[PDB]
Amino acid sequence: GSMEGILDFSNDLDIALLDQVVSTFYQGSGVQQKQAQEILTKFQDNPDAWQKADQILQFSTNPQSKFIALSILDKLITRKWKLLPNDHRIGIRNFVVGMIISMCQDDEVFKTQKNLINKSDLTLVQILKQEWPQNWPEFIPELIGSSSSSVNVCENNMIVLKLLSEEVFDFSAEQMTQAKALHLKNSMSKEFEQIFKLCFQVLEQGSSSSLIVATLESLLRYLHWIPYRYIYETNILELLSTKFMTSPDTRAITLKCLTEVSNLKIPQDNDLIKRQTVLFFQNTLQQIATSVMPVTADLKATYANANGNDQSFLQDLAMFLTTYLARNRALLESDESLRELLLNAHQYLIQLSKIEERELFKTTLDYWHNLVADLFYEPLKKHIYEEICSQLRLVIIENMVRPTIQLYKSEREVLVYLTHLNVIDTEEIMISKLARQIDGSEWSWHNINTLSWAIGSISGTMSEDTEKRFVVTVIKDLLGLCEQKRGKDNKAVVASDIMYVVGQYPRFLKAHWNFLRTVILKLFEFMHETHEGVQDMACDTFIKIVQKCKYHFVIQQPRESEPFIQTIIRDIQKTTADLQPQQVHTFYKACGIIISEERSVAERNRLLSDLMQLPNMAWDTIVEQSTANPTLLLDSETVKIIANIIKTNVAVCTSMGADFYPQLGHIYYNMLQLYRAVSSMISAQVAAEGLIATKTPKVRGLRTIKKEILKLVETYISKARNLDDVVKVLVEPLLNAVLEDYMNNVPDARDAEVLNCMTTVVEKVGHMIPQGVILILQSVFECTLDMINKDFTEYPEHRVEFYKLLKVINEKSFAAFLELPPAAFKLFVDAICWAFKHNNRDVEVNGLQIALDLVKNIERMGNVPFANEFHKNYFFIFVSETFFVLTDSDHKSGFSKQALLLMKLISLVYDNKISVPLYQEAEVPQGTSNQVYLSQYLANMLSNAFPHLTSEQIASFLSALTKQCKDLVVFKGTLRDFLVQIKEVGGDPTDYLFAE
Amino acid sequence: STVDEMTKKFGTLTIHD
Amino acid sequence: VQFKLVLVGDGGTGKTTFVKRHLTGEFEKKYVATLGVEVHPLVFHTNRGPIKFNVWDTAGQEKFGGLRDGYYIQAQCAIIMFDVTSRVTYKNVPNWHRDLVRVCENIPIVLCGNKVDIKDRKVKAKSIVFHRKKNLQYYDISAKSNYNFEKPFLWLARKLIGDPNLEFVAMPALAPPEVDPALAAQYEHDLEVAQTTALPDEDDDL
Amino acid sequence: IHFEPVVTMEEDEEVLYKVRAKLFRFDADAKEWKERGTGDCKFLKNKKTNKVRILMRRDKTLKICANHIIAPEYTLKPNVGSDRSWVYACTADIAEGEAEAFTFAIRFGSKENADKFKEEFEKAQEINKKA
Ligand SMILES: Nc1nc2c(ncn2[C@@H]2O[C@H](COP(=O)(O)OP(=O)(O)NP(=O)(O)O)[C@@H](O)[C@H]2O)c(=O)[nH]1
Ligand SMILES: [Cl-]
Ligand SMILES: [Mg+2]
Secondary structure, three states, rough: OOOHHOOOOOOOOOOOHHHHHHHHHHHHHHHHHHHHHHHHHHHOOOHHHHHHHHHHHHOOOOHHHHHHHHHHOOOOHHOOOOHHHHHHHHHHHHHHHHHHHHHHOOOOHHHHHHHHHHHHHHHHHHHHHHOOOOOOHHHHHHHHHHHOOOOHHHEEEEEEEHHHHHHHOOOOOOOOHHHHHHHHHHOOOOOOOHHHHHHHHHHHOOOOHHHHHHHHHHHHHHOOOOOOOHHHHOOOOHHHHHHHHHHHHHHHHHHHHHHHHHHOOOOOOOHHHHHHHHHHHHHHHHHHHOOOOOOOOOOOHHHHHHOHHHHHHHHHHHHHHHHHHHHHHHHHHOOOOOHHHHHHHHHHHHHHHHOOOHHHHHHHHHHHHHHHHHHHHOOOHHHHHHHHHHHHHHHHHHHOOOOOOHHHHHHHHHHHHHHHHHHHHHHHHHHHHHHHHHHOOOOOOOHHHHHHHHHHOOOOOOOOOHHHHHHHHHHHHHHHHHHOOOHHHHHHHHHHHHHHHHHHOOHHHOOOHHHHHHHHHHHHHHHHOOOOOHHHHHHHHHHHHHHHOOHHHOOOOOOOOOOHHHHHHHHHHHOOOOOOHHHHHHHHHHHHHOOOOOOOHHHHHHHHHHHHHHHHHHHHHHHHHHHHHHHHOHHHHHHHHHHHHHHHHOOOOOOOHHHHHHHHHHHHHHHHHHHHHHHHHHHHHHHHHHHHHHHHHHHHHHHHHHHHHHHHHHHHHHHOOOOOHHHHHHHHHHHHHHHHHHHHOHHHOOOOOOOHHHHHHHHHHHHOOOHHHHHHHHHHHHHHHHHHOOOOOOHHHHHHHHHHHHHHHHHHHHHHHHHHHHHHHHHHHHHHHHHOOOOOHHHHHHHHHHHHHHHHHHHHHOOHEEEEEEEEHEEEHHHHHHHHHHHHHOOOOHHHHHHHHHHHHHHHOOOOOOOOOOOOOOOOOOOOOOOOHHHHHHHHHHHHHOOOHHHHHHHHHHHHHHHHOOHHHHHHHHHHHHHHHHHOOOHHHHHHOOOO | HHHHHHHHHHHOOOOOO | EEEEEEEEEOOOHHHHHHHHHHHHHHOOOOOOOOEEEEEEEEEEEEEEEEEEEEEEEEEEOHOOOHHHHHOOOOOEEEEHHHHHHHHHHHHHHHHHHHHHHHOOOOEEEEEEEEOOOOOOOOOHHHHHHHHHHHHHEEEOOOOOOOOOOOHHHHHHHHHOOOOOOOOEOOOOOOOOOOOHHHHHHHHHHHHHHHHHOOOOOOOOOO | OOOOOOOOOOOOOEEEEEEEEEEEEEEOOOEEEEEEEEEEEEEEOOOOOOOEEEEEEEEOOOOOEEEEEEEOOOOEEOOOOOOEEEHHHEEEEEOOOOEEEEEEEEEOOOOOHHHHHHHHHHHHHHHHHHH
């Protein structure tokens, strides 16, 4: 279109045209906006646009155009400043400084173009980072001087200094080299005495609110690093905690400053310092009570109303109080005259903790945890806080969340502490709360759920006798509450809360068998209830109680004729008749927990056989039927039956582990034959219908059978104790059933769960089956690698499981890679490096660990032909491939492990652990050390990959890096320094002497 | 006996009017 | 009544997917990096009337950054996004916040930890505290499962309108029209393809 | 004595059927299905005309992702990858304003709910045939 004219640099820049593009972008819409956007990005990215920046800044009337001009200048200053002729550098500085002065002198511009002035201030700071103080020693003196001639200039100078402090102390770690950061930190520290004087004078004298606020904003940044004497040996704390807490325009920033003061490095000896720390807290709290709101105010209501900046203020007040009191409350706990202050501050926190705001509640709760833990352990403290703690009990009980998971655990911990501190008070609050559920004054589904969670959360805190009375009272009252209510909906809610509380008090259940049996039988009744959620609740409570009370199901209880587990198995068909499949499996898993408590082998195996009677009979039947007619496996009903049988076995094996072997032996051979039959059917369907067959319900049901078979074998082998049987009985039939099927299926039909199953086998018994591991590699390695080496996205599960398998083979049976033919071992190396390049952490991490373990495996072989050829063939491949991901800015998540691998590789040469020349006889003179050749290779590699670096930069980087290859922390710092320098031109090569 | 009273009551727990 | 919203965060955190979900209801599974910025109007119906967000969906990858902080000018609200399965994206939250509030000095800002649907979470809930001192609202979200996906806009709407009781409400449902034998074969063709293209995510609950 | 005290467009329809579902639209130029919304799918019978439509809204935002007459010409057909979904052509849906034509797929939590939807869908087609 027409707007593209600004991209033609042969002609002069038409500013009026620039603004039509800029206005169209910022104020336009639709297609026009999108076009101007692409034009502006192209204009901005022109490496010569900076030359046209002073034109835009001088003659444009559009603030956005001048902003973009400064962004263009920013790119130049931060990346290519040092390549410029010195004249341009002086010129650029001059017309940035001059522009800032002019904008500050025009009051209309100063107040209406804040964004543009702030951008100019940051651009100035970028120049200071390049030039100051070595080429600009008068900046700070001249800044302080200019401040006196104009309130506007003085206010803006506070903005510049704020940004300078941020760039030097807050955001330098990853953006500057260590040496440059230290240089600028020292320079600011050298001249801060003058800076502080100006800042204090402004605060003590100034009357312009905007100037005061800017000065306080800069002070907030200083408090991150300045020595404490500037705060405690001046009168600044008085000003902050009194004057500036009264006016709302300075209140927010002042409170943030005082929060950071509460974190300064302060001597713990001086009693006058402690007095000053007490004093500014006293002053702040007094100003809050007189100028903002009294202690009694309803902060919950104020926050909910959301007037003005009330929400941010209450957030900041919570941060101030919690920060100060976590560090300094002991200062207030001994002196009688400070007791009211201590308790008023905690009362504000009580009121803040009633606010309905999740993230703010977590902030106050973190503090309460700190307090009640100290009251639990510290002598002679808990009595000070009795009234605070009593209120807190109610707050936490009334805001209990659903057992969100982290928040519940935090709430439980505080409430447990609070219960120990006063068990009587806790119990009375909870019983009262329950009364107000029964009398209806506070009744609701939410309120009864919350109270039940709180009651259940303190299990274990009371004596068993007190707990007995308490549990009986709560359950009686809850039982009456359920009878009282009408409608399934209300009764279901209460009945579920009853079961929740019961399941939280296993000590009670263990001591009262007759009650425990009644509970279980009631849960079995609820398993026939169709009301939404009841059956899930009944099964979840059942397995939860079993996990804790299993012993009382496996013994024969007094007055009973058999262990209750027998009774459960006798009626299992009736009990579960109405459950969905997932719920039946939970039931069987719970039975397996109990059965594994029986350590009589013959009794345990008998219980196991009886539990599995129904699935085993269903299994025997459709092993006969399925065999006589493989068509059945196309019947969705038979497929679903089979999958649920296997899922039942998985559930029981999950809880019984090693004890499951007799049941596995009952089905194992017929199960693997089924795996083959299913496999043939899947292949036949894909052949008859195409790859789309894998999406059909029929094939998905068939593949579920295969996946559950693999999961069952996985589950048992991962828990097996007799590994001789795993090797002699299980592995060979397994590999024969799964490996060829995987290799010879088309990619879209290969189950990634095969790889996962093989990983478990290798992990558990890999050391005992070296020929089996070779067979695994032969069947899955090349064909899986070909699935995943064309892009980083296809076959995501195979990708992850593939490198998990290679990793465990490399750990447990490294000899299998030694048997690979040279061509396949080369693919192995390619596969490892390919993993480096993934952004997917589930692949990149394993790729780097395999590489590290492989180098270690090679090193362990000593001076032998395979190790020597490995270094000759692959050492520099790994060095260069690791360097590539380290420096390409697209794998920052792997930096730590990339650095470790690189340091290991370099240390091999540094320690002469490689016995052959890494070079060829013709490359370098005879006798050249691998050390020298490594440095030459790396120097040449970096020169071609980063041609804008000087030879001196590269040599100094490599000298430091190799010297530091036994010091990972320092090694990583030098790598980070290199990553900074490659982003710019003219980096200082002495930076790499920082550690030395 | 207080546990036995409560247990008897628990045995009649029900969710339908 | 329209408000400019700037959406920032590391590349790959789900910013574009999140907006797309709100615009069309779809979940885009492919990662196609945003180049510079994409602007999309987004309207919500509330008990205070419609509210329109002009969403500036910016690029998180540095090599595609475009005008970078130039996009933030005159923004009235913002969402900072990171990925709870990638620690580096949370480590960079202070950097995005820094660049944002230097241009937009007092706007409501939501911090969003996306991808909570993924089991292997890497940025733990207890580690996420940056919003506290910066007065940002925080939400766990998932553009995939839609967990909390409306909360960022609901909170911003309440701040921008100044009404803490604002609620999303059901847009009016106009009566639909009623119902060309010349296109009976053109639609049966598009239908034959549609039937033979498997629906995605067949294991999801819906 | 007298004390003065302190000072959607679905309302006129009947709900024949309601079910949670996920709605898809087919993008024929990308050859892939795209989700349009998840929420309650309702068959709404107008009390004045006795005509039935499908009205579906997304959870939380409550934005309309389907609004069209259950025309008696439409035909539900299965999708190759699902036993709990139906594919059918729609020639006038006004969820996003201007009446467009779509190839929709709607999926349910179970084959059972999908079969019920089919039943109700065809019953509603009969309702609309008479009116
Ligand atoms: N599992 C999961 N994946 C998600 C979620 N949100 C987005 N993704 C995926 O993350 C990848 C990147 O999504 P995208 O929206 O492009 O991220 P972006 O922040 O816009 N990247 P850029 O800054 O380069 O434009 C996509 O593959 C997307 O499907 C989520 O909530 N859960
Ligand atoms: Cl036990
Ligand atoms: Mg994007």
